[PDB]
Design a protein around this ligand. Sequence first.
Ligand code: HEC
Ligand code: HEM
Ligand code: HEM
Ligand code: HEM
Lengths: 98, 111, 78, 64, 49, 82, 379, 162, 241, 48
Amino acid sequence: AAKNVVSQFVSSMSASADVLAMSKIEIKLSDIPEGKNMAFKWRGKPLFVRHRTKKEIDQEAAVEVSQLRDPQHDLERVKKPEWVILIGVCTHLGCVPI
Amino acid sequence: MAGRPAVSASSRWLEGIRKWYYNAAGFNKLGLMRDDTIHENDDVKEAIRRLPENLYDDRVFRIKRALDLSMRQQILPKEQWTKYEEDKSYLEPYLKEVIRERKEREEWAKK
Amino acid sequence: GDPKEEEEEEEELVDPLTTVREQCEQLEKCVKARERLELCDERVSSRSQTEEDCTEELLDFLHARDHCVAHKLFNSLK
Amino acid sequence: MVAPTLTARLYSLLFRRTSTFALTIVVGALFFERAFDQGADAIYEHINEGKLWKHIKHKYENKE
Amino acid sequence: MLTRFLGPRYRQLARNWVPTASLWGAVGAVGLVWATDWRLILDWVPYIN
Amino acid sequence: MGRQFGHLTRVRHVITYSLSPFEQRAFPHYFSKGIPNVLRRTRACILRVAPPFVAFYLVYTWGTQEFEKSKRKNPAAYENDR
Amino acid sequence: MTNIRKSHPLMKIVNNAFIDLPAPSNISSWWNFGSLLGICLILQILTGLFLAMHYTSDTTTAFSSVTHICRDVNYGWIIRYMHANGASMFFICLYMHVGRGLYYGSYTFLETWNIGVILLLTVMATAFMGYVLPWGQMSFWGATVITNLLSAIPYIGTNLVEWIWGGFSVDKATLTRFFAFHFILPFIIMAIAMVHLLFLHETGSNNPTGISSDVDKIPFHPYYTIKDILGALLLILALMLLVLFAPDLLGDPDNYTPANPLNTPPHIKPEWYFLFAYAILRSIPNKLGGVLALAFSILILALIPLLHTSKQRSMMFRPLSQCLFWALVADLLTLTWIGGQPVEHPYITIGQLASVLYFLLILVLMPTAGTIENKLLKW
Amino acid sequence: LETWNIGVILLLTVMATAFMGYVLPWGQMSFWGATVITNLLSAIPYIGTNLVEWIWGGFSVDKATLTRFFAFHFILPFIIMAIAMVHLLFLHETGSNNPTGISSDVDKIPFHPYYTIKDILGALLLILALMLLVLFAPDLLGDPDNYTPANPLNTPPHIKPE
Amino acid sequence: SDLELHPPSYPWSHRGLLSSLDHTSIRRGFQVYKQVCSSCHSMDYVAYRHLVGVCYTEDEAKALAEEVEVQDGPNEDGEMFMRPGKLSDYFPKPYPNPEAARAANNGALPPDLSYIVRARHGGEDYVFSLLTGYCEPPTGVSLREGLYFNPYFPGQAIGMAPPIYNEVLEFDDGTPATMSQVAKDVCTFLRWAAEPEHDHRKRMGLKMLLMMGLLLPLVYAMKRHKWSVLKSRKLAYRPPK
Amino acid sequence: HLVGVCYTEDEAKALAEEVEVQDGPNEDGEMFMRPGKLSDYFPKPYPN
Ligand code: HEC
Ligand code: HEM
Ligand code: HEM
Ligand code: HEM
């Protein structure tokens, strides 16, 4: 009995299912052209839409794998090098970029 | 309250109603005399302190066993109840003197 | 508007409720009340003007029938 | 609760030491809670057979 | 009030503490009037008119 | 809080006996004497408890009956006629 | 038991009042309501705090936030109903706490009893502003009639009503003030409840016999903690029975429509624990008389200790007073029944008679009952 | 030791209350000051994001977090009163301290006529200092950026707590 | 007329202490709402996502939501624009403001159907009797235009044309759309729209009864065991001489 | 707010009535224009 009632009160501060409904959003791709970005609301944080062009994809693979804190390639982070969607927050504390 | 012993009775005599009320009160069923259930104010408490040792010690056990009866929500057998006629005021003589003492003390601060 | 069907289909369809209306249409409670309903209707209609109606008598007739209707209505649904 | 009985071994094995007394309370809570939910829920389905969503969910999602 | 019974000793006690109780109600009167500027009362003082 | 066991009162010449809770049955003669007890307890109070609440039901059964009678129309259609 | 326990200048000695406190052995079941009241109090704070994490006091989003609590918040529906039905359990437990003192003469503890009335007033005030929080056509209108009763006072009645309202009528200004006031008042009750116990531990409990129990005191910890735990479960069972099987059994259905100042509900009435007070006020055509009688009936508790006449203290051995006590309880139930009914001809007579009997019993019949028995016992 | 340890607990409670109350105005310093500090809990291993969202009531600081803070900001100060009473309870048993640091049992004085009037003078110096800010420089300490409504899409020029 | 009639206590599939809602009826009950009620009755507290796991699947409810166009706030140029609805969208509002609603009807304002089961005396029993209780006005009663006689309605004159008749709609599963059957489904739906917690309310209720039905005898045993010392306690008074 | 600060009550009423404002649902259920009042806030140049 104690575990159930405690978990019921703890669960109240977690999801608030009306919040969970807006977890996934939909947005067009033809509104913005290549290079430019648009900012809107997703999960309470700003996210941007970017369209990689022909002369920027090649430079992505130019950086060596063993050059950052965590070794990560560029051909696996995206399902297709044509498009990319990213959340406009700082990876440290969550601050939007310019 | 319940039907009076005679037939139904509105108010007959005086000792009959008092005897009927004594059994109705029900403190005899716990083995307590009348003065074992009195309210202990600053007057009665002093008049208890003047009780003789034999009488005071008897009162302690009568109260002690009554609380045992009340704890179990039981009563004493029919033969161990406090008879109304056999009930006697062991505290009235001591109360009266404290009544006399307090009235004299109060009226001395008034005159 | 209320108990009509679109009709023209098979047997034009029927409702369980209107049949059950006939259940307390023979019960003793709802035949006596209907007798009172007629008396109010005959009395009120006869008078040229009267600020009275038969709502109370109708409600008494409805109260008896509807309660008996609710007893044996849901078994014919679903 | 007499000479060779279940409770005599139950007390000595577990309840003799208060440290193991708490173990059966927490371990017993694990097994009781798992069985109680399934035990109490299975009654609910029997009372409401063909009523809840899971009893009519099979009618959709390509299963019918 | 300010006594216990009805006797000459308490009657003297009540009379002896009347002037202090007499002026103690002024604090209850003026202080309450001062707190909420009781107009009907503030309309009679000459300097505060 | 200035009051604890040791100075509560003066008790003399009283002997008490008690048993270990493990050497006695928790529910001894539950229905053997408890049920005859509750009948004794209820009778001792039914003459002082029931009559006050029996009257309230009589008020209930009459105050509500009159209320519906007020809402019910009365045959006062005369003096108008046809 | 492990050592000499050493130490001691800490807060443990304050907890000796919960473990080593002497208590009468014959304390009946009518006493768990003391610990039940504490259980109810910390239960309202626990559920209330989690309710306040999703409730917004603005009128445009007050009612809609209550719906969001039940419809959207995970397990948020139960918390709202143990809060709504807990107040029903609070006042159920509150009225038996008062009733036991009436029967067992616990009002002889003048300090504790007087603080008890203050505790009663604080909860009734706290529960009143909580009902206005959902803002549901019973919150708006229930608060409309009750607060407008203060307009009967002269020279301050109109001034303080607007001061209470924060405007010319109940509105968003009143709603925000109530939620803030409803948040703080329960924490005042905790402080007073500790003060309430502080005036009782000096003299101990009050055995149903009514005689001094100093000869048969028992430790609290092994006997009454397990007795209060059983009493707590009976409270949880009773409260949870409402919440999980009839959540709206006590609450009025009209409260589920959003408050509309232009529309009046078919019947306007407060919650069931204030219904007896409503009947007394409605029994007098006068407006000033009604508000005074409404306050006097609640404040008559402080006048009870000054009306004691019997040489005994508890009603255990007072059969004449026992008949009057259950007549008062039955009459208090008649007042509750009258309050929930509209003001028509069968209830104006019953309402006036019940109210005139409520004051007549305590003020006249009960003190005369104690005097009569004093003659019957030769003292 | 008893009083000092309760003192740290008292300190932690106030900094929690002050931080939670700063988010109440919701003014681009409240939203973003709470954003950076609360996101620090995501660094906790294996439970960071689990409790960060449980604090947030969602995926980021939003209306769900704002309502929770106001309710939490209401309750915590009344907890501080209870702890402060316990804070004194662990001190009056062992007395007070002196600048000398030696036991002052040989030269104790009554509190009522000497320190009540000393605390009243100290209280006025507090009221004077507090009222000096309020009536002559109300926004001297607060950051000016807090007066623009919170905008999650825009970041302040400089992020910083009180 | 100004008189009250007590609604009959219709048996329900969810009238028991542990009985749950019939989710088959809920699915049919919504079909009444989306075709009959939604024309002039609002439900602004139930979303299209609420029907998931109750009466429709996720794909079913998404199709239902996308069937109705709704507003999606300001465009990039700061203008309104229509778009197909989503799961998170609430049920469409027939009118923008209550003033429009009073204009659409003969002044009467259709109450919100989200809580109408719990906001009326009698619950679904009154609503079911109200929907099916229409009858010809008795002799001696005159009704103004736009007013219809319904005894279950307080006042007996309601601004409601009979909204349910035989074969007014068509049910997906093929059950006959009779006058009484359609009212039963919407009443079942209107209860779920008012108390979505109804199933979990009883599910935890049964668990409580089994849990508390076992603990209460057990907790009583601990009380008796600890108190058995005082219950079996003999007092002896042995004063001197 | 400008009353008693920079404009009189009559001056501020003229300033407010000089600009039309949109508020109040008509009994037909539609928005309609009206001259502003003292209680009206300064007009918003753009809706969003
Ligand atoms: C013709 C448009 C229209 C239709 C279609 C409609 N309603 Fe209504 N409804 C109204 C109006 C107008 C009122 C208010 C009547 C009044 O207050 O006199 C109302 C009121 C109600 C009430 C309130 C009754 C009361 O006593 O408060 C309920 C319940 C209700 N409707 C249910 C339904 C249901 C269920 C349906 C679908 C079968 C439905 N309505 C279809 C227009 C409509
Ligand atoms: C003795 C303490 C309390 C009592 C007697 C009490 C009583 C009530 C009552 C009767 C209601 C009406 C609910 C309804 O009718 O639907 C209510 C609502 C409410 N209370 Fe309290 N309350 C107490 C303490 C608190 C506390 C401490 C808080 C917050 C910290 C709180 C927050 C709320 C809220 C937000 C509501 C509106 C939400 C709802 O009604 O479900 N309450 N309260
Ligand atoms: C939130 C409200 C209250 C709380 C938490 C509370 C708490 C308590 C507790 C725990 C006790 C001791 C338990 C017991 O002796 O049975 C007690 C005693 C008492 N209380 Fe309260 N109480 C509250 C309100 C009231 C009220 C409304 C009254 C009205 C008269 C009251 C009057 C008394 C009295 C007379 C006693 C004496 C008990 C005795 O005779 O031993 N209290 N209170
Ligand atoms: C709201 C927060 C606090 C309140 C109301 C409070 C209150 C008090 C008061 C009134 C005293 C006695 C006054 C005096 O002796 O000068 C005291 C003593 C003390 N407090 Fe706190 N305090 C708080 C927070 C703290 C904090 C943050 C600390 C951090 C170490 C602390 C540690 C102490 C200590 C060490 C003493 C010893 C005084 C002595 O040696 O005479 N308290 N507290």
